[PDB]
Amino acid sequence: PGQGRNNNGLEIGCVVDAASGLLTFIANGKELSTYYQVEPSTKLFPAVFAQATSPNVFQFELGRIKNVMPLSAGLFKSEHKNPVPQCPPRLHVQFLS
Amino acid sequence: NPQPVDTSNITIPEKLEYFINKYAEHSHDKWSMDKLANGWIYGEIYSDSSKVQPLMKPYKLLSEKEKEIYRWPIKESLKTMLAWGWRIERTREGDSMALYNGYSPRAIDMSNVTLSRDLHAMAEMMAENYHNIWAKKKKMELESKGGGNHPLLVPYDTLTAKEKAKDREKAQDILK
Amino acid sequence: RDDYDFLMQTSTYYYSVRIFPGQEPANVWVGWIT
C-alpha cells in the first residue's frame, strides 16, 4: 500500500514448515511471493536485520496464526505439544558483534 | 528589530498544491486528536462550551473557508521557505506515493521519524525567522498598547529552550 | 477456532515482527539465518 505502515502494524510473519522445509512469509494477511526451500536437517534461527531510524525499532512477537504451531513448541522439546505461545528465559535476543 | 523574510513578491507553485492539501489534512487530523483528547464530540451545531464541533468530519467535508484557516499558515510558511530558494524536489518515491493515492483519528506519529544534521540546521533557522514573524506581530500590538518590553521579545538566540520548543516542533513537524 | 487435531499433528511454526511506526521498512529485513 505504501507509506501507511506507521498507522499500525507492519507485522511481517515468518512461516516455517519443518516437515516440508518450505519457508513462507506473510505480510498484513497476504502471502508474499518470496519463498525458500531449505535442505533437510537445516537449523534456522529467527533473525531480523534493521538499520534503526527511530528510538523504537521492531519487536519480536511469538504469537500463532490460524492452524500454525507457535515458535516455542518448535524451539523447546518439552513444549512440543503445548499450543500456548511461550517465551522461556532461555530464549533471548542476540546481536552480531 | 524583527526582520521577517518577505515572501509576498514570490508566488506559490502548482507543484506544492497537493502537499498543501495533504498537510492541511494532517493538521486537521491533529486538531481532531487534540479535541478528542480534550473530550470533544462531533455535532451538527458548533458550541464551544458543550465540547461539540462539526469539524471532526474530514477536512474534505470541511467547507473551503474552514479549510483556508489551516491552508494560509501552511502556504505562508512554505513561501517563506521558498524565498531562500530551498530546492524542494518531489523524488520518485514522492510522485510514487502520489500515484498510490467523527472519523477514527488517524495521523502519522511524527516523533519517531527523525530529520538529519543538515535538516536540523534548516529547522533551527526556520524557527529563527519564524519567531521573527511572531515578534513582528508582537511588536506591532506592542505599539498598540504604547510601550514596554515583552518578556519574550528578546531575540531568538536570547530565548531559552522552552519558548523555542514550540517553534522547533512546528518547523520539524513541517520538515518531517 | 484452530482445529486441535491439525494443530497437534502439524510441524509448522510461526513468529512475527512488528515494525514500529517511524522505522523505515526498507531498512529492516526479516527472515531466518543459519
UniProtKB/Swiss-Prot annotation, chain B:
- Disease per record: Ventricular tachycardia, catecholaminergic polymorphic, 1, with or without atrial dysfunction and/or dilated cardiomyopathy: An arrhythmogenic disorder characterized by stress-induced, bidirectional ventricular tachycardia that may degenerate into cardiac arrest and cause sudden death. Patients present with recurrent syncope, seizures, or sudden death after physical activity or emotional stress. CPVT1 inheritance is autosomal dominant.
Q: Identify this protein by name.
A: Ryanodine receptor 2
Q: What does this protein do?
A: Cytosolic calcium-activated calcium channel that mediates the release of Ca(2+) from the sarcoplasmic reticulum into the cytosol and thereby plays a key role in triggering cardiac muscle contraction. Aberrant channel activation can lead to cardiac arrhythmia. In cardiac myocytes, calcium release is triggered by increased Ca(2+) cytosolic levels due to activation of the L-type calcium channel CACNA1C. The calcium channel activity is modulated by formation of heterotetramers with RYR3. Required for cellular calcium ion homeostasis. Required for embryonic heart development.
- Each sequence repeat occupies one of these ranges, namely 1-101, 102-176
Q: Any domain commentary?
A: The calcium release channel activity resides in the C-terminal region while the remaining part of the protein resides in the cytoplasm.
Modified sites of kind Phosphoserine = S96
Q: Note the subunit structure.
A: Homotetramer. Can also form heterotetramers with RYR1 and RYR3. Interacts with FKBP1A and FKBP1B; these interactions may stabilize the channel in its closed state and prevent Ca(2+) leaks. Interacts with CALM and S100A1; these interactions regulate channel activity. Identified in a complex composed of RYR2, FKBP1B, PKA catalytic subunit, PRKAR2A, AKAP6, and the protein phosphatases PP2A and PP1. Interacts directly with FKBP1B, PKA, PP1 and PP2A. Interacts with SELENON. In cardiac muscles, identified in a complex, composed of FSD2, CMYA5 and RYR2.
Family, similarity comment: Belongs to the ryanodine receptor (TC 1.A.3.1) family. RYR2 subfamily.
Q: What are the cysteine partners in each disulfide bond?
A: none
Curated annotation (Swiss-Prot), chain C:
Q: What induces it?
A: By TGFB1.
Tissue specificity: Detected in heart muscle (at protein level). Heart muscle, brain (cerebellum and hippocampus) and placenta.
Give the comment on domains.
The calcium release channel activity resides in the C-terminal region while the remaining part of the protein resides in the cytoplasm.
Subunit and partners: Homotetramer. Can also form heterotetramers with RYR1 and RYR3. Interacts with FKBP1A and FKBP1B; these interactions may stabilize the channel in its closed state and prevent Ca(2+) leaks. Interacts with CALM and S100A1; these interactions regulate channel activity. Identified in a complex composed of RYR2, FKBP1B, PKA catalytic subunit, PRKAR2A, AKAP6, and the protein phosphatases PP2A and PP1. Interacts directly with FKBP1B, PKA, PP1 and PP2A. Interacts with SELENON. In cardiac muscles, identified in a complex, composed of FSD2, CMYA5 and RYR2.
Origin, by domain of life?
Answer: Eukaryota
Q: Which organism is it from?
A: Homo sapiens (Human)
The condition associated with this protein in its record is: Ventricular tachycardia, catecholaminergic polymorphic, 1, with or without atrial dysfunction and/or dilated cardiomyopathy: An arrhythmogenic disorder characterized by stress-induced, bidirectional ventricular tachycardia that may degenerate into cardiac arrest and cause sudden death. Patients present with recurrent syncope, seizures, or sudden death after physical activity or emotional stress. CPVT1 inheritance is autosomal dominant.
* Free-text function comment from the UniProt entry: Cytosolic calcium-activated calcium channel that mediates the release of Ca(2+) from the sarcoplasmic reticulum into the cytosol and thereby plays a key role in triggering cardiac muscle contraction. Aberrant channel activation can lead to cardiac arrhythmia. In cardiac myocytes, calcium release is triggered by increased Ca(2+) cytosolic levels due to activation of the L-type calcium channel CACNA1C. The calcium channel activity is modulated by formation of heterotetramers with RYR3. Required for cellular calcium ion homeostasis. Required for embryonic heart development.
Tell me the name of the encoding gene.
RYR2
Spell out the family assignment given in the record's similarity comment.
Belongs to the ryanodine receptor (TC 1.A.3.1) family. RYR2 subfamily.
Name the record gives this protein: Ryanodine receptor 2
Which compartment or compartments is the protein found in?
Answer: Sarcoplasmic reticulum membrane
Post-translational modification (record): Channel activity is modulated by phosphorylation. Phosphorylation is increased in failing heart, leading to calcium leaks and increased cytoplasmic Ca(2+) levels.
